[PDB]
């Protein structure tokens, strides 16, 4: 910008989307990456592999297409994140992928967070991913318990468009139950 000798960062650096130092360390495994992202309303999981002209996604899952199997709840919470990871994981196994490395991009490694939930889900889907159990939220939270009790301290339904009153972690179970099953169109 200033002159000839001026150094402009790599595009993905100036856009503040890619931590290259972490990237390199990730790519050194030689394994595919379980790319876990999240938006205010959604959560996305992708199994990316290295390629000649850019990365290559072999499988993936979004929280949106979660409904496609019986989900009427919000898509930016813990139950949502886990199931998305599992869905992406299952499809991963389909395309022949057997192992991965968690790539939480620019998210923080907070214990019990969603990027770690996406991981536990992808692992239950049968994918081999280096992890650490005591960093994953406890089962119940994943189910949605924490939000049930929050609705417990009622006065005004937690959810606006009545998905239910006292919310439901039991639904999470129905959906997880539907994914772990064979049939299902991945």
């Amino acid at each position: 910008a200033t002159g000839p000798r001026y150094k402009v960062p790599m595009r993905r650096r100036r856009e503040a989307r890619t931590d290259y130092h972490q990237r390199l360390r990730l790519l050194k495994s030689g394994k595919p990456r379980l790319v876990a992202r999240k938006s205010n309303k959604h959560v996305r999981a992708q199994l990316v592999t290295l390629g000649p002209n850019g990365d290559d996604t072999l499988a993936s899952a979004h929280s949106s297409d979660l409904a496609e199997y019986g989900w009427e709840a919000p898509t930016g919470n813990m139950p949502s994140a886990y199931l998305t990871g599992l869905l992406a994981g299952l499809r991963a196994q389909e395309a022949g992928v057997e192992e991965a490395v968690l790539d939480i991009g620019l998210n923080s490694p907070t214990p019990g967070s969603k990027v770690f939930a996406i991981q536990e889900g992808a692992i239950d889907a049968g994918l081999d991913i280096p992890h650490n159990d005591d960093v994953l939220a406890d089962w119940q939270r994943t189910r949605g318990a924490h939000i049930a009790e929050y609705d417990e301290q009622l006065e005004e339904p937690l959810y606006s468009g009545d998905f239910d009153a006292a919310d439901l972690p039991e639904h999470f179970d129905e959906l997880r139950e539907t994914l772990l099953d064979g049939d299902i169109e991945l």
Binding site: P4, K7, Y20, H21, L27
Partner: peptide, 14 residues
């Protein structure tokens, strides 16, 4: 060369 200054792209290192 000044413009190639700074951490290099990981692609060629892998």
């Amino acid at each position: 060369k000044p413009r190639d200054r700074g951490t290099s792209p990981p692609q060629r290192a892998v």
